[PDB]
Write a protein that binds this ligand. Structure first.
Ligand SMILES: *[C@@H]1O[C@H](CO)[C@@H](O[C@@H]2O[C@H](CO)[C@@H](O)[C@H](O)[C@H]2NC(C)=O)[C@H](O)[C@H]1NC(C)=O
Ligand SMILES: *[C@@H]1O[C@H](CO)[C@@H](O[C@@H]2O[C@H](CO)[C@@H](O)[C@H](O)[C@H]2NC(C)=O)[C@H](O)[C@H]1NC(C)=O
Ligand SMILES: *[C@@H]1O[C@H](CO)[C@@H](O)[C@H](O)[C@H]1NC(C)=O
Ligand SMILES: *[C@@H]1O[C@H](CO)[C@@H](O)[C@H](O)[C@H]1NC(C)=O
Ligand SMILES: *[C@@H]1O[C@H](CO)[C@@H](O)[C@H](O)[C@H]1NC(C)=O
Lengths: 344, 261, 41, 116, 50
């Protein structure tokens, strides 16, 4: 899209204020710049000479153009073989971003036929509209009175069964929009329905590439690798995605932003994110002691107060349409009452 | 004293067991990378009625209009209508108007399904089981002075512990109020929390999570997941200059990065 | 058992009241039979 | 089976008490069954006047309230219950004799070259 | 509203909160750390003990 258009703009947030705290702590100035891509950095064979190389922030740090990766970098085994690490500042796990009759007409025809032969039983027994409005009072609430009270028992037991199966329809049979983590059997053998994906060239892809027992998920997310997580948020807001493997507190902050964003139940791979560092350097011991000093006090709670800690029945399920139907039935019956005006 | 006296004075090599990490311990020896996330914790024990009112006035107005067309139900239809809202067969007035009978029958079926929805509301409130939280964390208003409330509650820590050092580096007045509230045994503090000899207890997070995960009946309830707490980790303490640190770090990253941990 | 957990997946609505409504039809047929008895008196 | 029997016996007891109310102190002699089993289901079919009759109707109506509560409990207990139907019981099935015995001609086979 | 709450909490008391008469195998956490209440044993010198 934009090959070479690099401008100075204003950056702020969590790690920016963390670096401001570090500059307040120690004896240094700094120079904040960005990375050329939206990728952490993966080890891949370059096409010439058959050699595995890196890219991204690891490719820019080892090239000497950078000095310190101040980013929530994924700590794993392969990165520590080449560079050194500090104490982690972030501690979080992994999660999934998701998005959150005719029989009555038969009973009506039955009570119409019941009313008809009750009117017939009134006729054969040694008046008309009185029995009509009496049936209008009965169905909703001397030989004909016995059938009327037996049918009133029928009416109460039918509306009791109606209450029972409406409660059954609203409590038990609920569609599971959640996934409950990796242990969903429909995601173990996926299809074109449940769209789960991840960031292109992310460390989660390498972490699942080491896990050879779920290689089918490795062959499924490769068809839907996105460049940035904002693309995944834009695609899941427009209902193009269905699931997204990502860290916990970032999706919790996005759930605080947008209430429709829901995390999953399973909390696995409880890992930590630290600051990307160089090799053996005089900025290792002092900086780690400063990070531990930031851990021991309530400055982590202050950084939570900046962004992390701060956040941003109804009885209208299916009776709003019934409410409109009642209003429309009253308006439609007003014309029949005009017919009753013209009749009398 | 203890494991610090064994490792710093070089009577051992490394501390594999559990150990909290603070500033001076990281000054005297070199910890490894943290593998488990173990912090600290504290153990303790609208328009619906508006639109109903609007359509109630609409139904009453239509019934009064039809009664003015075709013996006391002008100003008295409110009691009949709002009594047949609740559907309890209260003797009110004999219905003679056809519009009144049909419209109040439709309104009564709407009231029957409305009370069915209210029973559904009660069932949905019953399914949602509450989990109340008295103390939110270390920044509680209770954790300033127990004289603010009329029963003075009590809470303490483990003796000669690093939690006491974290309190004395955070709040020395908290240590002053804990000085009258000291105890000795972890199981003694557990029995004091169960029987009622102690209100709350400050300890580490994951050990109390394991004790609550095997407790008979789960009477004691934890507080959060370390949100207003320290939320630190445990590493492996090695001496300054040991060449074994890199291999142990690679082995820990192998143990975490495959699901075996 | 771990291999069976790895290689096997042991798993496990709508309104229907045909038995209760069939009893309703049977009892109303009995009721109209009783009315057909009481027709001659 | 005995539920309707005991409700019938207590209904005759209630009607006999209403007859006793008529013997002491209007048209509800045998009509006590009508208004009685009508006010079981709360139908408001077109009035108790006797004090004994009002107290007895109140006790029997609270019994009807807890009876319909128990019937909603029975409906919930049937709502928890969900079953499945099974045609073939095993190798001793009557389907394993002749498919002309049943009205749809069914079919079942195995894999070729198999030990089954 | 009183009789509705009465129906609601009687159904609450009889439907959901049933005491656990079943154990569902070895994965009961109360059988992991037992006490004097849950009395469970087997035949002496049986192969189940081995
Ligand atoms: C906690 O530490 C203190 C020292 O800071 C211990 O107090 C002394 O411990 C020695 C150990 O030999 C005893 O001989 C002394 O008698 C103790 N002093 C007193 C005043 O009793 C203490 O034992 C440690 N234990 C606790 C309570 O956690
Ligand atoms: C069952 O096995 C036999 C092979 O022994 C196959 O049946 C026929 O066998 C003869 C002799 O080998 C071949 O000439 C035929 O071509 C075979 N038929 C077929 C369908 O190829 C048969 O392949 C096996 N069962 C099936 C249906 O696959
Ligand atoms: C930090 O380094 C600068 C280098 O010029 C020096 O002037 C200053 O005294 C040092 N002290 C601080 C402010 O940390
Ligand atoms: C990239 O390098 C690999 C090395 O095997 C080669 O297979 C592939 O074709 C190369 N891609 C290009 C240059 O299109
Ligand atoms: C911090 O840096 C100084 C040198 O600038 C060094 O002497 C000291 O040992 C380091 N450790 C501390 C106190 O953080």
């Amino acid at each position: 899209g934009s090959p070479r258009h690099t401008v100075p703009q204003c950056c702020y947030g969590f790690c920016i204020d963390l670096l401001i705290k570090l500059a307040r702590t120690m004896n240094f100035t700094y120079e904040v710049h960005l990375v050329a891509d939206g990728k952490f950095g993966t080890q891949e064979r370059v096409n010439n000479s058959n050699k595995k190389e890196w890219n991204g922030m690891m490719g820019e740090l080892l090239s000497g153009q950078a000095d310190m990766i101040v980013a929530p970098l994924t700590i794993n085994n392969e990165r520590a073989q080449y560079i050194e690490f500090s104490k982690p500042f972030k501690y979080q796990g992994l999660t999934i971003l998701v998005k959150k009759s005719t029989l009555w007409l038969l009973v009506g025809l039955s009570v119409h036929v019941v009313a008809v032969m009750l009117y017939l039983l009134d006729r054969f027994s040694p008046t008309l509209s009185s029995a009509m409005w009496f049936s209008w009072g009965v169905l909703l609430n001397f030989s004909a009175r016995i059938l009327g009270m037996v049918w009133a028992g029928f009416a109460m037991i039918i509306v009791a069964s109606y209450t029972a199966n409406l409660a059954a329809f609203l409590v038990l049979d609920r569609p599971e929009e959640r996934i409950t983590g990796i242990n969903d059997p429909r995601l173990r053998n996926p299809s074109d329905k449940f769209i789960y994906a991840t960031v292109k060239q992310s460390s989660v892809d390498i972490y699942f590439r080491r896990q050879v027992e779920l290689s089918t998920m490795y062959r499924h997310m490769e068809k839907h690798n996105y460049e940035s997580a904002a693309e995944a948020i834009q695609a899941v807001r427009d209902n193009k995605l269905h699931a997204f493997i990502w860290d916990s507190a970032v999706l919790e902050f996005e759930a605080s932003q947008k209430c429709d964003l829901v995390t999953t139940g399973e909390l696995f791979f409880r890992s930590g994110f630290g600051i990307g560092m160089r090799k053996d350097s005089p900025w290792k011991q002092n900086v780690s002691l400063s990070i531990l000093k930031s851990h021991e006090n309530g400055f982590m709670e202050d950084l939570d107060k900046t962004w992390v800690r701060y956040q941003e029945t109804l009885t209208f399920e299916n009776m709003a349409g019934v409410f409109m139907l009642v209003a429309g039935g009253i308006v439609a019956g007003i014309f029949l009452i005009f017919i009753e005006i013209a009749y009398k | 004293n203890g494991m610090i006296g064994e490792v710093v004075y070089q009577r051992a090599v490394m501390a594999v067991g559990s150990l909290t990490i603070n500033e001076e311990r990281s000054e005297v020896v070199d910890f490894s990378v943290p593998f488990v996330e173990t912090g600290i914790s504290v153990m303790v024990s609208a328009s619906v009625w508006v639109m109903m009112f609007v359509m109630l006035l609409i139904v009453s107005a239509i019934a009064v209009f039809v009664f003015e067309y075709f013996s006391f139900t002008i100003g008295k239809a409110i009691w009949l209508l709002w009594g047949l809202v609740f559907n309890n067969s209260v003797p009110v007035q004999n219905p003679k108007g056809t519009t009144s009978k049909i419209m109040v029958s439709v309104w009564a079926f709407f009231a029957v399904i409305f009370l069915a929805s209210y029973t559904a509301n009660l069932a949905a409130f019953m399914i949602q089981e509450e989990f109340v939280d008295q103390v939110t964390g270390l920044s509680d208003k209770k954790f300033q002075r127990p004289h603010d409330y009329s029963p003075p509650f009590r809470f303490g820590t483990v003796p000669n512990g690093s939690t006491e050092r974290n309190i004395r580096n955070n709040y020395p007045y908290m240590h002053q109020y804990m000085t009258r509230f000291n105890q000795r045994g972890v199981e003694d503090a557990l029995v004091s929390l169960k029987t009622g000899k102690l209100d709350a207890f400050i300890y580490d997070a994951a050990v109390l999570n394991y004790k609550a995960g095997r407790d008979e009946g789960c009477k004691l309830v934890t507080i959060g997941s370390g949100y207003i707490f320290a939320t630190t980790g445990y590493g492996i303490a090695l001496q300054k200059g040991s060449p074994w640190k890199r291999q142990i770090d690679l082995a820990l990253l192998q143990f975490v990065g495959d699901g075996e941990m | 058992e771990e291999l069976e957990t790895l290689w096997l997946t042991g798993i496990c609505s709508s309104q229907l009241d045909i038995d209760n409504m069939a009893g309703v039809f049977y009892m109303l047929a009995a009721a109209m039979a009783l009315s057909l008895i009481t027709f001659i008196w």
